[PDB]
């Protein structure tokens, strides 16, 4: 039984087996070792495209799967996410995917269960499958970490997948860089270096946008101009390299971090990084369940 | 891969070879041709039995089913419908079944995405798989189209179904009547003859009725009167021909629109149309996928 | 056609064929009389921990399942659930098993309706799979009720379930005690006897815990210190006999009820009772469809 709660707890090693083995099962391998086993989905924070992503995943491996969005009438009750577990263990639940609003809810869970826990997201954010279909995408393009440029942009401060790809990328043996509005971004970062989105477009292997959202303080940092202001135009993206892709993990705030053509013009791979999203959390099941 | 949008859309032979078909499959023929294909229920607006019918018809099918129920969290966080349809075919969706609030949401859609659309509503209230079963019903009874007196009863001018049924009821070479309050009609053509629902259930060979909504109810008063005004009462249906049925889509507003007793009558076929929608439903999915 | 309504109307013979029956399945027994057909769970009010257990039982039986969560459109659209059921038996389900908040509402289902229903709580708190997994679990543990001492503990007057298992446990043998507040106790009662939990430890073969839930309405009863005056404690769970077991229907609200280190001691089938509950609903859904 492997959980999976972040990327830093996986080897570079393991990485990049997942990598592989969810290029071969994109490439058709395929068998019947998971077939009738049982996946629960526990999405006490809900993510429909997250959500459905690990059920098609789950579904071509030939698993039954138990659905929950939102609140459960048990932890209603006040329910420990422990006795969830549990509970799903005793009726004959293999593996849960959770996405759960608090902080690290797995450190303490993953040495006390029995089946094995996917951290689909968790309260301070980390989100390993993403970065894995992420780094999964990179790969194919270039097959090899070593010596990329990787530009992340938005609200790195509260982003903590922007930050966890920012680090296992350096890991990787890539260089990152960072734009977005100051106020966003983490004064003392130890991978990325902080620059303009005018420069890291022509520095760039590699283009990342986050969505940027709406909420915190006052600052709401006028999503109407944002795209201009901070964001992938058009004009900035002709000044990408010939080679150089874009990368978002959706969902698109068209007209904001990019300019609607540019979703699918030819250096985007958004869609492809959702291809890929099933075949990194197959990957991700069979290793949560190999014996 | 074909899409089922609106009514208007089939030609007559179409409409006829999905009624075979269904009545095909009602009689037990089944293949494995879409055996572990996947089917997303998209109703972004709520409707239960309809959602139920569809499902069916995909598990039938031996398909994987995603479903989503209500509002999607990657809409709230602003995606069109086209990025959902195309996240969809990434994820690797072979068929979405749609239920959305906004008018003709499909057109836009049907010239961008690249799998099969399946309309179960849009903002319009076009709703063709409805039709096709009150036609497959029909059919069932009868045998033919031509020649039959068809008459629709209720809130005409609000109810696209009801318009699209007559529309394409006459393509087929019956008569269509229409009755109910004149406020409610809309009688610029609309392809059938208004005349009084005493005089339409002594004609009629099928007697069709709409959901008086409570919405279009002026008064609890027009609400409790309706029956005996405008409705199918006892005394009405005891005047109905010898070979004549009673249809509606459900759900039924017993003591308005028709007498609590009538519902499960001889005449009555509002049940059998259920049975047929789910058959109408696998029939349209094989169309939708054919290769 | 078989349903299940309350633990009243099986007999004592039905309910040992039952327990032998998910006996059986628990030992893996298993066949194909089920694959493919349809089962709805219709939780009109939700019990997650419930449903998940029902729909483990139907998928192990190879059945296709339908869910519902919460409110139904077309109820809210006023349909009985009369027209409901009959709108399922339409479109193909089997079986229907039902949470709903109207008190026996089953009762007028259960002469109207062609399909079996499965009772999984309905107003009064009838919930019979509860009480049936309850009873394996004893009847595992000491092969028999006769002469077993059953005490039951915890607001006994606000519990259909605690109420429900002493009746039931009376008819197949065995004593029934209650403790708890006094005020909680259902003075009226014919099946139990009112004691300390300090004495019913001792006397005790089995101690079935109920959830202390907040309620603050003349059973304003501290949930602070309700462990130590009320609850069992460390110390009186050390003074239980040697083969006598600890039972709850979860979730459990550690620390009032019980000790928190209790919950997984050497004498707990708390999670035992979970594991139950899922071939006592396969027992019980084979039992509806049989011949």
């Known amino acids: 039984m492997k959980h999976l709660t972040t990327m830093s707890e996986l080897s570079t090693e393991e990485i990049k087996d997942l990598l592989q083995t969810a290029q071969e099962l994109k490439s058709g391998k395929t068998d ?16 429909t495209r997250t959500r459905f992503s690990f059920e098609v995943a789950e579904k071509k491996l030939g698993m039954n799967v138990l659905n929950l969005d939102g609140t459960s009438t048990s932890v209603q009750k006040g329910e420990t996410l422990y006795d969830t577990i549990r509970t799903l263990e005793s009726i004959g639940v293999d593996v849960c995917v959770i996405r759960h609003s608090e902080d690290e809810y797995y450190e303490e869970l993953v040495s006390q269960v029995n089946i094995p826990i996917l951290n689909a997201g968790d309260g301070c954010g980390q989100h390993p499958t993403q970065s894995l279909l992420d780094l999964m995408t990179i790969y194919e393009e270039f097959n090899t970490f070593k010596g990329l440029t990787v530009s992340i942009h938005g609200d790195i401060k509260h982003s903590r997948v922007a930050r966890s790809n920012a680090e296992v990328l350096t890991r990787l043996g890539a260089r990152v860089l960072f734009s977005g509005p100051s106020e966003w971004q983490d004064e003392e970062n130890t991978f990325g270096t902080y620059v303009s989105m005018d420069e890291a477009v022509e520095s760039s292997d590699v283009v990342m946008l986050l969505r940027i959202q709406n909420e915190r303080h006052q600052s709401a940092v006028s999503q109407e101009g944002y795209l201009n202001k901070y964001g992938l135009t058009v004009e900035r993206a002709e000044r990408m390299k010939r080679h ?39 990957a991700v099941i069979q290793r949560a369940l190999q014996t």
Chains 1, 2, 3 share one sequence.
């Not at 019947?32 to 993510?47: D, I, R």
């Not at 874009?246 to 958004?270: C, F, Q, Y």
């Open 32 to 47: 019947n070792q998971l077939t009738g086993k049982f996946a629960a989905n526990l999405f006490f924070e809900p993510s």
């Open 244 to 282: 150089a892709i874009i990368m978002h993990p959706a969902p698109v705030n068209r007209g904001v971090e990019i300019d609607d053509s540019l979703v699918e013009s030819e250096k985007s791979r958004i869609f492809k990084q959702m291809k890929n999203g099933v075949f990194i959390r197959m």
